[PDB]
């Protein structure tokens, strides 16, 4: 039930191992970052609405801080998520390579020589 917490050489509380630096960082115009900024903007608008302030124009510095904080956190969140998926793929490929007898390559037949059953529609 705990897949990758016990992976060897895993430092407890880094949130970003040094090996992650070999991966391309997400672009600053990543659509996920844009969505995080939109979430921050929505948080700012809801904050204005709750405090009975003009929703769109009241706090400009507060809305800017909201958007900036959301984007800042989302950048590192995306980095960690991409690194974790890279680890998953790396481990999967290494395990497949090291166990050829469990992932055999069987010759594939062409469809002219595979017999499929025909089910008429009527």
């Amino acid at each position: 039930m705990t897949m990758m917490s016990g992976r060897p050489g895993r430092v407890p509380l880094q949130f970003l191992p040094n090996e992650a630096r070999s991966l391309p960082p997400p672009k600053l115009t990543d659509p996920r970052l844009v969505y995080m900024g939109f979430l921050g903007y929505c948080s700012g608008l809801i904050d204005n609405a709750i405090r009975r302030r003009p929703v769109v124009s009241a706090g400009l510095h507060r809305q800017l801080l909201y958007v900036t904080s959301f984007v800042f956190f989302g950048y590192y969140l995306l980095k960690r998520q991409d690194y974790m998926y890279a680890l998953r793929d790396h481990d999967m490929f290494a395990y497949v390579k090291s166990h050829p007898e469990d992932f055999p390559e069987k010759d594939k037949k062409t469809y002219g020589e595979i017999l499929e059953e025909f089910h008429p529609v009527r």
Partner: protein
């Protein structure tokens, strides 16, 4: 005219009789035909001549697109998605072409039935047998595939028919 090929859409030599009047009474159909000619067919012809004159000054062309022959579904391995996709596209194109062929044969049959008048039952036997052959072939190819049809299902139907025919031939060989 010469716009359409006369081999794909043939017609008999169009024999028509010559008028042989038997009475001195004037024929009203001939007079009405002359009136119709002089009042309708000449202005229409002149308008068409002007239209063709304007069209001739601006001549451009459009081309019939040619498609290469790509490998069919029989020579694609089980999980090769690209070869499967190209074979399926080719098969769908061939299906449309076969539909149009059947349409041409049906047009021939309809034209024969209208043209032959009271003797269509005898003078349209060749068109009828042509349509019978094409209909049998098209049925064997594509019938009962149902919606969500594919080249794989057509291949399966063909293989089932081939197996049945081979078994019948083998059992007849022992008779």
């Amino acid at each position: 005219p010469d716009s359409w090929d006369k081999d794909v859409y043939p017609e008999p030599p169009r024999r028509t009789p010559a008028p042989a009047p038997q009475t001195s009474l004037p024929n009203p159909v001939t007079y009405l035909t002359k009136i119709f000619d002089l009042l309708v067919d000449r202005p229409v012809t002149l308008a068409r001549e002007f239209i063709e004159q304007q069209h001739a000054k601006n001549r451009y062309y459009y081309y019939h697109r040619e498609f290469r022959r790509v490998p069919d579904i029989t020579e694609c391995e089980e999980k090769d998605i690209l070869c499967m996709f190209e074979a399926e596209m080719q098969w769908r194109r061939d299906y449309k072409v076969d539909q149009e062929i059947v349409n041409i044969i049906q047009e021939r049959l309809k034209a024969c039935q209208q043209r032959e008048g009271e003797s269509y039952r005898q003078n349209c036997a060749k068109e009828l047998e042509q349509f019978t052959q094409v209909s049998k072939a098209f049925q064997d190819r594509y019938s009962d595939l149902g919606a969500h049809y594919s080249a794989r299902k057509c291949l399966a139907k063909q293989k089932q028919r081939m197996l049945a025919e081979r078994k019948a031939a083998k059992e007849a060989a022992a008779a």
